[PDB]
């Protein structure tokens, strides 16, 4: 296909390895590039942890209001929001918003702890039918992105199907799904990634991720006007441990996808 040829050309120009999955909810058609290869998720995994806590809140109806203590020992490498509340508390809702909209790593670790460890996040993926996702570590070591290492990876196809189920499907209850959508639409870290390759008119909710080996990721739900929504996953990683991030590759992949509508 023409889109597959342009994505291959983009990958060749970039020097790395690119993975893309698009789901068009209009006809349930899919476009895949390296769709079944594993990529390190980095912070895109935060969506699964937040969704797992939302699922718990279907039965524990005030869970999201539960205060959680932030102590100095809890702070890791990147904690833009949690730092503002050290020696105080944040609710699970506030921690979920911080993990999703600012990529706060302390917030992610608190969500992992609430779920009983990485195995609790992976279990939620299995419960909604994702047999590919695996979360093995906490922050910040889940971002090592070592070539060939299966820890903390998924495939573009699997993450696109899961993100569709969580945001447009019924894997979560109605209030929970609406909350997740609201959080994703309010992300602050995504301006230079998928969003930058799409019409300024389209509404996007996304979660970025970055890590070692120049790993640069973004997963998005896209609402074009007068048209069914799309789900787009773009993963990118590079051969040198110290490579720079390449958000422009993700923007270019989105632009190529959008050309073909």
Residue numbers in the entry: 27 to 57, 59 to 238, 240 to 289
Text taken from the publication that reported this structure:
Serial crystallography at conventional synchrotron light sources (SSX) offers the possibility to routinely collect data at room temperature using micrometre-sized crystals of biological macromolecules. We show here the versatility of this setup and methodology by performing structural studies at room temperature (RT) of three additional enzyme systems of biological relevance: (i) Klebsiella pneumoniae CTX-M-14 β-lactamase, a β-lactamase relevant to multi-antibiotic resistance mechanisms; (ii) Nectria haematococca xylanase GH11, a highly active xylanase suitable for industrial applications; and (iii) Aspergillus flavus urate oxidase (UOX) in the presence of the long-lived intermediate-like 5-per­oxy-9-methyl-isourate (5PMUA).
CTX-M-14 belongs to the extended spectrum β-lactamases (ESBLs) that play an important role in emerging multi-antibiotic resistance mechanisms. Three more independent runs with microcrystals of CTX-M-14 were collected, yielding 61 331 indexable detector frames from a total of 127 171 recorded frames (dataset ‘all’). This corresponds to a 48.2% average ‘indexing fraction’ with 28.7 ng of protein consumed per indexable detector frame and a total volume of 91.4 µl microcrystalline suspension used. Data collection and refinement statistics are, as expected, superior for the combination of all runs, and the nominal resolution (based on a CC1/2 cut-off of 0.15) extends to 1.4 Å (in comparison with 1.55 Å for the ‘mini’ data collection). The datasets collected here allowed us to determine the first non-cryogenic structure of inhibitor-free CTX-M-14. Like in the EuXFEL structure, two N-terminal residues that could be built in the cryogenic structure (E25 and T26) could not be built in all three RT-SSX structures due to the absence of interpretable electron density. On the other hand, an additional residue (L289) could be built into electron density in two of the three datasets (‘all’ and 10k) from this study, which is a residue that was absent in both the EuXFEL and the cryogenic structure. The B factors and Wilson B factors of all RT structures are very similar and, as expected, higher than those of the structure refined against data collected under cryogenic conditions.
